[PDB]
RNA sequence: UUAAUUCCGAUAACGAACGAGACUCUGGCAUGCUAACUAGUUACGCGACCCCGGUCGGCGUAACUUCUUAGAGGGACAAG
RNA sequence: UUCGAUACCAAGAGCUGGUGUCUGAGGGAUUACGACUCGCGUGGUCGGACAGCACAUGUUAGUCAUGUAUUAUGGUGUUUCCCAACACGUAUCUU
């Protein structure tokens, strides 16, 4: 069979990551490792989100190879769980039906909204007179 | 054959001018042209405080000056685009030619 | 008799702009919507939906202003408000060609009858039309509209290789395409022109503006014939394949007249009457004819298409 | 905090009384319209101008518009 | 070469020789009318613009001053002889030159014109140049030991906001009288030309120009223009 | 009523100016555009290993611009 | 059951599109020439149309101006370095 590449990224924090989808058996891995070893542990089902709900079934006709740089632990995981979600709904739409994109979508966005939608926030500057962006230093009258 | 000119500029649209000028003239003179690649601005801060002396409440000025960098590189002999490069110099744009 | 409805399309997100039918699929239509996509539908003709939004062409920046198809059936040209065109093949929906060199919105785009010429009208006072490998063959600005361009069409008829252009100077400007040059002005209207289209027999134009008087100038002579006055604006205009019909969008209800006998042949409003409390109707936008001019399409504002069908 | 100033306000009225037959209902429409009628040198201040035109044009078919 | 700066500290050290350069001028040519300097670094030469008002003092007797300047700006600031050409150019519009006002001012009020006299004669010469709105404050030891603030103002004048930048052209200057430092800041508010030659191009970002429709007449009934 | 002498209303006041707002820099959006051996990707050939594949910041040059860079425009207005 | 339109191929036709032969209408810089500054060298700037031609000369224009070779203010030919048919001009090769 032919080409069926799609790579889309997702971004939660200044961290981002990018996910290659493509026929395949079903094989979701990060930098190398399964979903299984990806740190920390304690944010497994954060990972396991869109493979719990949309199941297996869908995803076991493609791989996804994500591979991630920027931000922390917890930002970098909200940036893959995003990433291989967006990935599947724009491989879904560009390579089989338009209803089955409609599908997943209405499943995914009406769970949560954020594994399709960036959360737009990013750390405000810091100004003087003050150890942080609004807290200010100690005034001291007398 | 391959010669790389560096465009250096504290002004963008007087750099952009430059640059968009000895791209048409490498077109129009039938020259193997890689495009301006722009590499990242330099962003010399410096911050001081804006009293001469010691007792105003704490205040401080933030000086910024942006530098910006292109090049574009040229597969032609030495002196066709020599004549070019000496055509459209600006007072604010910076000019680097190397040969190999 | 009558003209009745079965139900509504739902596959928009923006306001359906415009539609593109083909002759050899009469189970697909395009419309180009206020979004950046151009949905391809497949029609069922079932219970829960008359058709179902087969593909999704993406990949402009702006809203879509016009969709038109090819005599093929593996081409769909549109043209967008970002000043670009997008020469797609509907067997994925993947980008074959783009045209670049309007600078403002384009606004209405054409094909030949032969697939070979393309001619796009824009919110520059520029007619441009092009080769079919998107390089300007020529435009024109000089002796052209003094305002927007809105619609541009070509020949049906091109034993008269011509071309209709309406715009916002409230005249129709008639060009030879022997040489893309003025023949005749269409001077008498009283406000900026949405739509003209080209009777499908290729002799006569129709001309639907602000004020909401459809003017039906000639083609065969520099002369008009008579007028129509629909009472509201009239959005798009549309003619019958088969019949000597007009169809006109009269702001939120299309009116369709007999041409024999100057006399509504129907009217048609939506009596679903979902604007009760308080708000101005969601209107009609454009509307198309199927392959045979038995089934109506209109796009509306509120992301729908409703199908009307001649019951009789 | 969306009280538009005099400037908005002002350029609003002497657009429709100037340009009425162009400027309609639709927002992106007369955006485009007052983008063209008018050299206004900045795009927020094109953008807050052409909102509060089809807001006024919006009330006019209602009735009694003062200004 | 050899020694090699970065470009921080290049286009830093380029910038240093303008702060310097300009202060030498300044500190000379203050009492010759003397607007501004501009450097050109043409290949192999430093071709420095001086922009005065009255030319034939900056320039000396046949070149004397220009070759004196020439001589002193190449010994310290290192250059090759030959590669220092200076070319003196009168600013046509001087009313509308900040320093060119700031420094004419200073010479009259220690010459012995007025400081009322002075500042109006400033102010009226200003407004008829076509500057859209000036400002002239002369403060210091002004009628005895303590200090005061005069302040001269006709027409439009704005204060905050980037405008501020390319409308405003301002000049702060200090005179020597016998009492001590008078201190001068005359503001001169640019007019807008689409020439861009006395003011700038850029209309202010809140003056909305509408055109105005021409007023036609609507054809009544269908006509047509049929031609070949 | 507004963040605001910000507007609408009342109205012997009408029309304006400075400050406010506009403006400038930055923040976030583009699977659209112009471009990248001083950014990288997807393939591809060689090379190592585990049992055709898996991993490779091991190597090397055909497509490209999603990922990175900085230019232009688009975008949001209380618009629905 | 006869009257006129529709799914197709054969007889060549035209058109449009590709390709590009060719002239340059033009478009530009700068340097020719034109000036203004001059410290005498440049510098600034009109950037080929504004610039001048030698009565050389492309045409004729009131037949009255002139004072009847005549230069009217025929106002257009000679003539520098580039990109040049959206100047949709046309060769050839094809749809």
Redesign the interface.
Same mark, same amino acid.
Do not use: C, V
């Given at each position: 069979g032919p080409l069926q590449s799609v790579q889309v990224f997702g971004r939660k924090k200044t961290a981002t990551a990018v996910a290659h989808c493509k026929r395949g058996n079903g094989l979701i891995k990060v930098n190398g490792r399964p979903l299984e070893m990806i740190e920390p542990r304690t944010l497994q089902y954060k990972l396991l989100e869109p493979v719990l709900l949309l199941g297996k079934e869908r995803f076991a006709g493609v791989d996804i190879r994500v591979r991630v740089k920027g931000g922390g632990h917890v930002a970098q995981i909200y940036a893959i769980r995003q990433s291989i979600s967006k990935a599947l709904v724009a491989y879904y739409? *560009?390579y089989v039906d338009?209803?089955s *994109? *409609?599908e997943i979508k209405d499943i995914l966005i009406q769970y949560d909204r954020t594994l399709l939608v960036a959360d737009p926030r990013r750390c405000e500057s810091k100004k003087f007179g003050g150890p942080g962006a609004r807290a200010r230093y100690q005034k001291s009258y007398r | 054959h391959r010669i790389r000119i560096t465009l250096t500029s504290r002004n963008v649209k007087s750099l952009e001018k430059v640059c968009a000028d000895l791209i048409r003239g490498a077109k129009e003179k039938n020259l193997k042209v890689k495009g301006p690649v722009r590499m990242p601005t330099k962003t010399l801060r410096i911050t001081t405080r804006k009293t001469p002396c010691g007792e105003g409440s704490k205040t401080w000025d933030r000086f910024q000056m942006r530098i910006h960098k292109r090049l574009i590189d040229l597969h032609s002999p030495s002196e066709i685009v020599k004549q070019i490069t000496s055509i459209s110099i600006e007072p604010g744009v910076e000019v680097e030619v190397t040969i190999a | 008799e009558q003209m009745t409805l079965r139900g509504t399309l739902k596959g928009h997100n923006g306001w359906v702009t415009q539609i593109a039918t083909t002759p050899q699929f009469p189970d697909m239509i395009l419309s180009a919507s /206020?979004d950046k996509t151009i949905i391809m539908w497949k029609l069922t003709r079932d219970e829960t939906n008359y058709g179902?939004?087969? /593909?999704?062409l993406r990949g402009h920046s702006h809203?879509v202003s016009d969709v038109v198809i090819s005599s093929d059936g593996q081409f769909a040209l549109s043209g967008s408000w970002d000043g670009t065109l997008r020469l797609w093949d509907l067997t994925?929906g993947t980008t074959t060609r783009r045209f670049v060199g309007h600078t403002k919105?384009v606004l209405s785009v054409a094909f030949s009858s032969d697939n070979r010429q393309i001619v796009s009208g824009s /919110?520059d006072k520029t007619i441009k039309l092009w080769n079919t490998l998107g390089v300007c063959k020529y435009t024109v600005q000089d002796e052209s509209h003094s305002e927007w361009v809105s619609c541009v069409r070509f020949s049906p008829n091109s034993s008269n290789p011509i071309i209709v252009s309406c715009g916002?100077d409230?005249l129709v400007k008639v060009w030879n395409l022997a040489n893309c040059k003025?023949?005749?002005?269409?001077? &008498? =209207?009283? &406000?900026?022109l949405n739509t003209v289209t080209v009777s499908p027999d290729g002799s006569l134009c129709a001309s639907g503006g602000?004020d909401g008087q459809a003017?039906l100038?000639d083609l065969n %002579? &520099?002369? =008009?014939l008579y007028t129509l006055d629909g009472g509201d604006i009239i959005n798009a205009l549309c003619f019958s394949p088969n019949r000597y019909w007009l169809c006109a969008a009269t702001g939120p209800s299309i009116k369709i007249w007999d041409l024999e006998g100057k006399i509504i042949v129907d009217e048609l409003k939506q009596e679903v009457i979902s604007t009760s409390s308080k708000a %101005?109707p969601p209107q009609c936008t454009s509307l198309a004819w199927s392959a045979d001019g038995q089934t109506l399409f209109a796009g509306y504002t509120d992301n729908l298409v409703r199908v009307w069908q001649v019951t009789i | 905090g969306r009280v538009r100033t005099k400037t908005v306000k002002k350029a609003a009225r002497v657009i429709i009384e100037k340009y009425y037959?162009?400027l309609g209902?639709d927002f992106?429409t007369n955006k485009?319209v007052c983008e063209?009628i008018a050299i206004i040198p900045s795009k927020k201040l094109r953008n807050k101008i052409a909102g509060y035109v089809t807001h006024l044009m919006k009330r006019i078919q209602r009735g009694p518009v003062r200004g | 070469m050899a020694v090699q700066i970065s470009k921080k500290r290049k286009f830093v050290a380029d910038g240093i020789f303008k702060a310097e350069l300009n202060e030498f001028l300044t500190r000379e040519l203050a009492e010759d009318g003397y607007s501004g300097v501009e450097v050109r670094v043409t290949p192999t030469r430093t071709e420095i613009i001086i922009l005065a008002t009255r030319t034939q003092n900056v320039l000396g007797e046949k070149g004397r001053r220009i070759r004196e300047l020439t001589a002193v700006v190449q010994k310290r600031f290192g250059f090759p002889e030959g590669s220092v050409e200076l070319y003196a150019e009168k600013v046509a519009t001087r009313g509308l030159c900040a320093i060119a006002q700031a420094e004419s001012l200073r010479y009259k009020l220690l010459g012995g014109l007025a400081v009322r006299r002075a500042c109006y004669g400033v102010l009226r010469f200003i407004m008829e140049s076509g500057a859209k709105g000036c400002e002239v404050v002369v403060s210091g030891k002004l009628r005895g030991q303590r200090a005061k603030s005069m302040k001269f103002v006709d027409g439009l004048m704005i204060h905050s906001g980037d405008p501020v930048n390319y409308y405003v052209d301002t000049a702060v200057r200090h005179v020597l009288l016998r009492q001590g430092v008078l201190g001068i800041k005359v503001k001169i508010m640019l007019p807008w030309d689409p020439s861009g030659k006395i003011g700038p191009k850029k209309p202010l970002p809140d003056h909305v120009s509408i055109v105005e429709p021409k007023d036609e007449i609507?054809?009544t009934?269908?006509?047509?223009?049929?031609?070949?």
């Open positions: 739409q *560009k338009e209803a *994109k *409609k | - | /206020r179902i939004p087969q /593909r999704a809203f994925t919105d /919110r916002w409230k003025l023949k005749t002005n269409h001077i &008498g =209207h009283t &406000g900026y602000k003017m100038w %002579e &520099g002369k =008009h %101005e | 037959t162009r209902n992106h485009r063209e | 609507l054809p009934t269908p006509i047509s223009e049929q031609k070949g």
